[PDB]
């Protein structure tokens with residue numbers, strides 16, 4: 636079961652809508668994730684937009700207790716890969732921004748643009764359990780026009 640490889644964002648849910656709309660820090664268009672267990676690190680490559688233009692990021696996080704990872708980006712983040720199937724990853728992340736506000740978010744990742752409903756239903760359930768309403772879910776594939 637390998638989690639490392641190409642991963643593209645299809646949907647994101649957030650307890651704070653200010654963090655996921657147009658040009659927001661967490662409207663994240665993932666491209667790949669590499670879990671380096673020997674060195675207890677994780678490598679994340681994704682695009683985001685500022686001023687409506689795509690910008691690329693390559694971050695390095697550190698493995699912590701309970702299969703969680705810490706990474707700095709728009710404040711401090713602690714995330715976990717809550718679910719993994721042969722076709723998807725569901726990530727749960729808690730962000731504390733520079734102003735100190737806390738936000739919980741969820742993201743569904745896949746190998747391309749063709750979503751499997753089985754994975755999507757699990758994403759909606761994880762999102763609900765985290766107290767995030769359905770109306771707070773954004774369709775990221777629909778918004779991802781950044782480079783491959």
Ligand SMILES: COc1nccnc1CC(C)C
Nearest residue numbers: 663712714726728740741742
């Ligand atoms: C790829 O990023 C994400 N994917 C889903 C929800 N939130 C984020 C923010 C980080 C840094 C994990």
